[PDB]
């Protein structure tokens, strides 16, 4: 066991191993508080997240276990991984607090899309890396569920990492009105008309790629219905066969109430873009999720000819998610989480 030291920074007690120095507050959602620190063991600048109320309900205890299992699994150059996890507790009986340690990220895509001039070569390399990471994620039967520019970290050498996996977190208030939290989501799951599957992420990559090419949000809806009207004007309304896949009669009568519209000419929407970029956008932004290109298929598209290497596009170890269908008590979820903290082995 390392030696721990205690301090109060911005109304919060932080108890952390001596290896972590020069702690400085950086942010706090409702999920936890974050400090920047210098890790003396590895020489990296890191983010230290202290979870808030990790075991306050069955829902919160299960979400704590879910986040730790997912972070311990992810070992890929284009996906955030876990540098450390710790608790100052010396036994299960006194276990209350969980701290997570990752690489400190600087800029996100938003910073570079808003204020930088992007060549077609920059768009090829950024989208290649998103798809390389998604091939790995999807090979473990994980769905990200929240891909958007603020969840993509990018450095001065245009190298990219995926972060902030969807933990079944986002609330109704958070998805309401003129908000970036909804602009990248798939049409079939906008109002939960179909169940989630890894195909919804491929819609989000198309929305990101369009915005890197134009500098503008593709579907900036003022509410769920305005956003559906912008989507169907570009990709076309559905036909009878596809419509039948939505179980809810009300949604189909709602779908059935809009005037029919054809798919638009994407060369006349994305004026001047590389024709191979236009071709790949037509294969991602398909209304029927069964017909979208997969991450593994997209890596072999001619748009990525200068970067594609099928001997350096790895898949994941198998991921057991059977816990998701399991009914347990708060203390059972807490004991599973404790075992995962104490069994952690750090990377090389
Ligand atoms: N991916 C998919 C799945 C079922 C139906 C479908 O068509 C539509 C049409 C309009 C709005 C939403 N989904 C698309
Ligand atoms: Cl230490
Ligand atoms: Cl990492
Ligand atoms: Cl503790
Ligand atoms: Cl965003
Ligand atoms: Cl597993
Ligand atoms: Mg985020």
Ramachandran sector of residue 178 (left: φ over 0; alpha: ψ -120 to 50; beta: rest): beta
Of the candidates 98, 126, 306, the residue with the CA atom closest to the CA atom of residue 212: 126
The angle at the Cα of 218, spanning 178 to 241, to the nearest 5 degrees, equals 100
Q: Which ligand is nearest to the CA of 37?
A: 2
Which residues span the domain enclosing 144? Answer: 109-304
Using most ligand atoms within 8 A of CB, pick from 186, 193, 249 the residue to mutate for ligand 1. 193
Longest dimension (CA), the chain: 68
Report the pocket of ligand 1 as residue ranges, CB < 6 Å: 187-188, 193-194, 238, 242, 245-246, 255, 287-289
Q: How far apart are CA 63 and CA 32, in angstroms?
A: 13
CA of 245, closest atom in ligand 1: 4
Token pair in block for residue 278: 């236009």
228 CA closest ligand 1 atom index: 11
What residues sit around ligand 4, an ion, with C-beta below 5 angstroms? 87, 89, 96-97
The Cα–Cα gap between 77 and 80 comes to 8
Q: Which ligand is nearest to the CA of 16?
A: 2
For 313, the token pair is 């596009």
Binding residue per annotation — 30? yes
Q: How far is the CA of 180 from the centre of ligand 7 (A)?
A: 11
Experimental method of this PDB entry = X-ray
Q: Is 26 annotated as a binding residue?
A: yes
Which ligand 1 atom lies nearest to the CA of residue 232? 10
Three-state SS sequence of the chain: CCCEEEEEECCEEEEEECCEEEEEEEEECCCEEEEEEEECCCCCEEEEEEECCCCCCHHHHHHHHHHHHHHHHCCCCCECCCCEEECCCCCHHHCCCCEEEEECCCCEHHHHHHCCCCCHHHHHHHHHHHHHHHHHHHHCCCCCCCCCHHHEEECCCCCEEECCCCCCCCCCHHHCCCCHHHHCCCHHHHCCCCCCCCHHHHHHHHHHHHHHHHCCCCCCCCCHHHHHHHHHHHHCCCCHHHHCCCCCHHHHHHHCCCCCCCCCCHHHHCCCCCHHHHHHHHHHCCCCHHHCCCHHHHHCCHHHCCCCCCCCCCCCCCCCCHHHHCCCCHHHHHHHHHHHHHCCCCCC
Residues near 30 by beta carbon (within 8 Å), at least 6 away in sequence: 52
Distance CA 75, CA 82 (A): 9
C-alpha 279 – ligand 1 centre gap (Å)? 21
> Residue 302's closest CA among 293, 311, 291?
293
Rounded distance from Cα 291 to ligand 1 centre (Å): 11
Hey, which residues does 28 pair with through a beta bridge?
Answer: 33
With tokens 């189909």, the residue in question is: 252
The residue assigned the tokens 């369009």 is 210
Which amino acids are annotated catalytic?
A: 164
For ligand 2, the distance from its centroid to the CA atom of residue 17, given in whole angstroms, is 4
Distance CA 82, CA 348 (A): 12
Cα–Cα distance for residue pair 233/114, rounded to 1 Å: 26
Q: Are 203 and 285 in contact (CB under 8 A)?
A: yes
Which of 73, 20, 72, 85 is closest to 317 using CA atoms? 73
Residue 345 annotated as binding site: no
Ion ligand 5 neighbours (CB, 5 A) are 148-150, 180
CA 97 to ligand 5 center in whole angstroms: 30
Q: Which residues pair with 160 in a beta bridge?
A: 154
- Cβ neighbours of residue 75 closer than 8 Å, sequence gap 6 or more: 81, 316, 317, 347
Q: Would the annotation count 101 as a binding residue?
A: no
Resolution of the solved structure (Å): 1.6
CATH number at residue 264: 1.10.510.10
C-alpha distances (whole Å) from 118 to each of 108, 125, 219 are: 15, 11, 21
The reply to whether 29 sits in an annotated binding site is yes
Mutate to test the pocket of ligand 1, among 194, 203, 228 (most ligand atoms within 8 A of CB): 194
Cβ within 8 Å of residue 194, ≥6 positions away: 188, 245, 246, 289
Gap between the Cα atoms of 229 and 248, Å rounded:
19
C-alpha to C-alpha distance for 310 and 308, rounded to whole angstroms: 6
Q: What's the token pair of residue 188?
A: 């079939």
């Amino acid at each position: 066991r390392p030696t721990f030291y205690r301090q109060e920074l911005n109304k919060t007690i932080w108890e952390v191993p001596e290896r972590y120095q020069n702690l400085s507050p950086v942010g706090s959602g409702a999920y936890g508080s974050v400090c920047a620190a210098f890790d003396t063991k590895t020489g990296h600048r890191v983010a230290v997240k202290k979870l808030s109320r990790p075991f306050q309900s069955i829902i919160h205890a299960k979400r704590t276990y879910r986040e730790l299992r997912l972070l311990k699994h992810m070992k890929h150059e284009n996906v955030i991984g876990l540098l450390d996890v710790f608790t100052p507790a010396r036994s299960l009986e006194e276990f209350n607090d969980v701290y997570l340690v990752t690489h400190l990220m600087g800029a996100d895509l938003n910073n570079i899309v808003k204020c930088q001039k992007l060549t077609d070569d920059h768009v090829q390399f950024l989208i290649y890396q998103i798809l390389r990471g998604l091939k790995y994620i999807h090979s473990a039967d994980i769905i990200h569920r929240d891909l958007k520019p603020s969840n993509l970290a990018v450095n001065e050498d245009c190298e990219l990492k995926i972060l902030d996996f969807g933990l079944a977190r986002h609330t109704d208030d958070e998805m309401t009105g003129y908000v970036a939290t909804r602009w990248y989501r798939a049409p079939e799951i906008m109002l939960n008309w179909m169940h989630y599957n890894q195909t919804v992420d491929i819609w989000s990559v198309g929305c990101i790629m369009a915005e890197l090419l134009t500098g503008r949000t593709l579907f900036p809806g003022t509410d769920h219905i305005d956003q559906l009207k912008l989507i169907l004007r570009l990709v076309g309304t559905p036909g009878a066969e596809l419509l039948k896949k939505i179980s809810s009669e009300s949604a189909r009568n709602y779908i059935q109430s809009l005037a029919q519209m054809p798919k638009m000419n994407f060369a006349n929407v994305f004026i001047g873009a590389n024709p191979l970029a236009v071709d790949l956008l037509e294969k991602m932004l398909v209304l029927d999720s069964d017909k979208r290109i997969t991450a593994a298929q997209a890596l072999a598209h001619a748009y990525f000819a200068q970067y594609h290497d099928p001997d350096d596009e790895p898949v994941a170890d198998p991921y057991d998610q059977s816990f998701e269908s399991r009914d347990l008590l708060i203390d059972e979820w807490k004991s599973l989480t404790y075992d995962e903290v104490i069994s952690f082995v750090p990377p090389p």
